[PDB]
């Protein structure tokens, strides 16, 4: 009942408030539309055409024909682009993670999940009803130790390829080595890897040479680089079939709107035709990092700018905002108490003029902090 | 062929205004929303639709999710949690089980529409916080939940009532506002409602409706919302337009009932259907799939529930009514279903 109301008290008095409305007007360095494809003309046209062809939403789930030919065609397109045999779309990356992790583990199995994991995967781990071990961030030897000592026959090692927290890279090859050595599955969330890592933006798995691996399952969102909505699970065909019969986050879920599928497919075609875009987001990231005084070269789209106390940094975010530039802002308790930071999300579609605005605003705001 | 298996209850998925709304939304806001709705996703469009839907359903506030599934996850997880009690109806529990598991709460599963069982569960709890979860129209048999009784019992024990109106929206109510609104429970301070946008409203997504505090609470604490990139503008525009068509044309909501009755008449069912979907219980798990295959082979796709979904003695066909059903299609259904059922119950 009213229990809600002073668990407003506790976060009314304390540093947190929600939320805000836009309508396209200023410079956004906080979105994860890494390739700027969300508002690309061709993506808009693809979503519109798909919408006019199939209508709004669909109807049920599938094993032969519930949704559409559109979904399958896109699944094959994405799978072909990423080097996997099969793909299956979900309503979101969240539900894709739920479905995949639940279907590939279950009771009596082991899940080894990186500590800095997005959730998405914590809820998936809970929903899986498997034994969950949380291993230290990118600690390969810890994972190996967990896998070697297990009594459960079936094991899944879960990690992000590019971490949502700091944008750092996971040691996918080493992890896959320990996985194969102990007969474990490797499940990698490439939400921040797709369109960013790889010479052509195929993700970190493809970049480090693990595309098409028989014991690797990949998940990703369609809402970042591919600038749309929805999720996808990719891997060997058997994985897709298994998902089709068993996945409570897929059979009960009405799936993905045709418009989102068309937009994602178009975004994929533009990305495939323009590999330079994937380099462009990294280059822009580097530019932002140089503007912000960050010495560490960006390995992903997002640049973290650690300032310190949670009120010079929020002040920096407010000054940036009042000068037409919205940036990301992490503070306690989302991050450790001494590391309140700004977060700069690069996009491949950033023009030199927009970068000039960012340069002015960020230079001035940061110089006085 | 004739599809009697879809849940596009109002036939709005390809309604011209729905298409135009989605196209406009897409051309205005683009594909998806870049990020979540704590980033830059809370668009004027989402807010406007939430207010619109809340206004139509008589609720104070609404919050849209990427699906009805994630809407249920968010609502149930955020409003229960460790140290609380969840009382979940047995026949709605198989869609809501993931939410119950995710909730980290103590979960008691009560017999179908057994109000006194729920009361006994609420009275004997040690947890101050309790949530009773049910569907208004059950996906299993399309029957109605005793919402008024459940609410009386909830108020007796200071418990929250959580209702999934996925199959009630656009179907129950004089204007298709759902069962809660119909039995006079709209806008109740101790009732939270969820619904999909993918059935009657012929689009995609979910929504949680209730007191303003519920919405603010969800925005601040709901993990299937904060970590979720949300709902496409096109889906929101399509849903909004569908809602406007439904509000302007209540007869559609009446029509789906009428067709359902007709289907029930075709199948020999004596009870007038209380919802869009009609069950034809045959029996054995291959007299029913065989009947479904015969229907399919004569141009009509019907539903078929079997073990694990239903008890072994009641494997059945399911016929989903739509407002967009023509008299010609109803004639086809008459011919095919009468013929097949006579040959399945023989």
Backbone φ and ψ of A315, nearest 5°:
-70, -35
Q: Is the four-CA dihedral A316, A326, A160, A102 of positive or negative sign?
A: positive
Find, among A201, A199, A202, A223, the residue nearest to A212 by Cα: A202
Using a CB-CB distance cutoff of 8 angstroms, which residues of chain B are in contact with residue A32?
A: 34-35, 39, 229
Q: How far apart are CA B312 and CA A328, in angstroms?
A: 55
What angle (nearest 5°) sits at the alpha carbon of residue B233, between those of residues B230 and B239? 95
β-sheet bridge partners, residue A155: A110
b/e code A237-246 from CB counts within 10 Å (16+ = b): eebbebbbee
The tokens for A141 are: 């030897």
**Helix B16-29 and helix A258-273, axial crossing angle in degrees, nearest 10:** 40
Task: State CA B48 to chain mean position distance.
Answer: 22
Q: How far is CA B193 from CA B10, B95, B327, in A?
A: 21, 15, 35
Q: Is B3 helix (H, G, I), strand (E, B) or coil?
A: strand
Beta strands B84-89 and B106-110, pairing class = parallel
Is the bond leading into B308 cis (omega within 30 degrees of zero)? yes
Contact between residue B24 and residue B240 where contact means Cβ atoms under 8 Å apart: no
Q: How far is CA A50 from CA A58, A73, A223, A264, A337, in A?
A: 12, 12, 17, 11, 47
Contact between residue A258 and residue A54 where contact means Cβ atoms under 8 Å apart: yes
b/e code A4-23 from CB counts within 10 Å (16+ = b): beeeeeebeeeeeebeeebe
A213 Cα to chain B: minimum distance (Å): 28
Q: Does B190 sit within 8 Å of A56, measured CB to CB?
A: no
The tokens for B225 are: 């919302």
The kind and range of the H/E element at B69 are helix B68-79
Q: How far is CA B159 from CA A4, B80, B103, B125, in A?
A: 13, 11, 16, 11
DSSP state of A213: -
The tokens for A311 are: 């009120």
B137: left (phi over 0), alpha (psi -120 to 50) or beta: beta
Count of Cβ atoms closer than 10 Å to residue A72 Cβ: 16
Q: How far apart are CA A196 and CA A203, in angstroms?
A: 6
Q: How far apart are CA A79 and CA A205, in angstroms?
A: 13
Q: How far apart are CA B332 and CA B275, in angstroms?
A: 22
The tokens for A350 are: 């950033």
Resolution of the solved structure (Å) = 2.3
Instruction: Check if B204 contacts A (Cβ < 8 Å).
Output: yes
Q: How far apart are CA A86 and CA A72, in angstroms?
A: 10
Find, among A159, A152, A61, A163, the residue nearest to A105 by Cα: A152
Question: Which domains are seen in chain B, by residue range?
Answer: 1-14+250-346 (3.90.1150.10), 15-249 (3.40.640.10)
The tokens for B4 are: 């009697």
Which residues contact residue B124 at a Cβ distance below 8 angstroms, ignoring those fewer than 6 apart? none
Q: How far is CA B243 from CA A291, A308, B197, B199, in A?
A: 47, 48, 9, 12
DSSP state of B273: P
Q: How far apart are CA B180 and CA B193, in angstroms?
A: 9
Q: How far is CA A274 from CA A35, A301, A355, in A?
A: 10, 17, 21
Q: How far apart are CA B68 and CA B167, in angstroms?
A: 11
Q: Where are the beta strands (DSSP E) in B35-93?
A: 61-65, 84-89
Count of Cβ atoms closer than 10 Å to residue A26 Cβ: 11
Find, among B32, B38, B80, B81, the residue nearest to B63 by Cα: B38
Residue in chain A closest to B4 (alpha carbons) equals A59
Q: How far apart are CA B310 and CA B303, in angstroms?
A: 13
Closest in B73, B220, B235 to A18, CB measured: B220
Q: Does A248 sit within 8 Å of B202, measured CB to CB?
A: no
Q: How far apart are CA A251 and CA A2, in angstroms?
A: 36
Contact between residue A159 and residue A244 where contact means Cβ atoms under 8 Å apart: no
Q: How far apart are CA B225 and CA A119, in angstroms?
A: 11
Find, among B182, B178, B148, the residue nearest to B165 by Cα: B178
Closest in B18, B26, B102 to A48, CB measured: B26
Q: How far apart are CA A312 and CA B190, in angstroms?
A: 42
Taken as a whole, chain A contains a residue count of 369
Contact between residue B241 and residue B48 where contact means Cβ atoms under 8 Å apart: no
Q: After which residues is chain B broken (C to N over 2.5 A)?
A: none
Instruction: Check if B335 contacts A (Cβ < 8 Å).
Output: no
Q: How far apart are CA B110 and CA B93, in angstroms?
A: 9
A86 Cα to chain B: minimum distance (Å): 24
The tokens for A158 are: 């879960």
Instruction: Check if B48 contacts A (Cβ < 8 Å).
Output: no
Q: Where are the beta strands (DSSP E) in B48-167?
A: 61-65, 84-89, 106-110, 129-135, 160-164
Q: What is the 3-state secondary structure (H, E, C) of A270-324?
A: HHHHCCHHHHHHHHHHHHHHHHHCCCCCCCCCEEEEEEECCCCHHHHHHHHHHCC
Q: How far is CA B73 from CA B76, B80, B178, B261, in A?
A: 6, 11, 21, 34
Q: How far apart are CA A115 and CA A118, in angstroms?
A: 9
Which residues contact residue A14 at a Cβ distance below 8 angstroms, ignoring those fewer than 6 apart? none
B287: left (phi over 0), alpha (psi -120 to 50) or beta: alpha
> Structure solved using which method?
X-ray
Instruction: Check if B244 contacts A (Cβ < 8 Å).
Output: no
Contact between residue B99 and residue B223 where contact means Cβ atoms under 8 Å apart: no
Q: How far apart are CA B9 and CA A369, in angstroms?
A: 58
Backbone φ and ψ of A72, nearest 5°:
-65, -45
Taken as a whole, chain B contains a residue count of 346
Q: How far apart are CA B60 and CA B65, in angstroms?
A: 17
Instruction: Check if B63 contacts A (Cβ < 8 Å).
Output: no
The tokens for B188 are: 């109740």
Residue A43 CB burial class (10 angstroms; 0-12, 13-18, ≥19): buried
Alpha helices for chain A (secondary structure H): 3-13, 41-54, 69-82, 93-104, 121-128, 140-148, 172-181, 204-207, 237-245, 248-251, 258-273, 276-292, 313-322, 352-367
Which residues contact residue B143 at a Cβ distance below 8 angstroms, ignoring those fewer than 6 apart? B113, B137, B274, B275
Which residues contact residue B230 at a Cβ distance below 8 angstroms, ignoring those fewer than 6 apart? A229, B33, B36, B37, B41, B46, B64, B65, B66
Contact between residue B23 and residue A51 where contact means Cβ atoms under 8 Å apart: yes
């Amino acid at each position: 009942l009213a229990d809600i109301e002073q668990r407003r008290r506790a976060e009314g008095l304390r540093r947190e408030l929600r939320v805000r409305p836009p309508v396209a007007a200023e410079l956004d360095l906080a979105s994860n539309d890494y390739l700027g494809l969300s508002q690309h003309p061709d993506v808009l046209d693809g979503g519109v055409e798909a919408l006019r062809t199939w209508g709004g939403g669909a109807g049920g789930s599938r094993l032969v024909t519930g949704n559409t030919e559109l979904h399958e065609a896109f699944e094959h397109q994405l799978a072909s682009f990423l080097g996997a045999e099969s793909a299956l779309v979900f309503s979101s990356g969240y539900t894709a993670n739920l479905g995949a992790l639940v279907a590939l583990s279950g009771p009596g199995s082991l899940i080894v999940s990186d500590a800095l994991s997005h959730a998405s995967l914590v809820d998936a781990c809970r929903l899986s009803r498997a034994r969950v071990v949380v291993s230290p961030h990118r600690d390969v030897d810890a994972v190996d130790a967990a896998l070697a000592a297990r009594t459960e026959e079936r094991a899944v090692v879960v990690t992000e390829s590019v971490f949502s927290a700091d944008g750092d890279l996971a040691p996918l090859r080493d992890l896959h080595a320990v996985c194969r050595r102990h007969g474990a599955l490797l499940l990698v969330d490439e939400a921040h890897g797709l369109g960013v890592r790889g010479t052509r933006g195929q993700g970190l798995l493809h970049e480090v040479g693990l595309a098409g691996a028989p014991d690797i399952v990949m998940t990703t969102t369609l809402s970042k680089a591919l600038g749309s909505q929805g999720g996808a699970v990719l891997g060997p065909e058997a994985v897709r079939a298994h998902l089709i019969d068993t996945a409570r986050s897929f059979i009960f879920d009405t799936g993905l709107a045709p418009a989102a599928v068309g937009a994602a497919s178009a975004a994929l075609r533009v990305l495939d035709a323009e590999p330079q875009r994937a380099r462009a987001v990294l280059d822009r990231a580097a530019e932002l990092a140089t503007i912000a005084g960050v010495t560490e070269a960006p390995v992903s789209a997002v640049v973290s700018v650690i300032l310190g106390d949670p009120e010079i940094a929020v002040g920096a975010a407010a000054a940036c905002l009042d000068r037409g530039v919205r940036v990301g802002c992490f503070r306690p308790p989302t991050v450790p108490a001494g590391t309140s930071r700004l977060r700069l999300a690069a996009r491949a579609s950033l023009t030199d003029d927009e970068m000039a605005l960012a340069r002015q605003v960020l230079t001035d705001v940061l110089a006085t902090a």
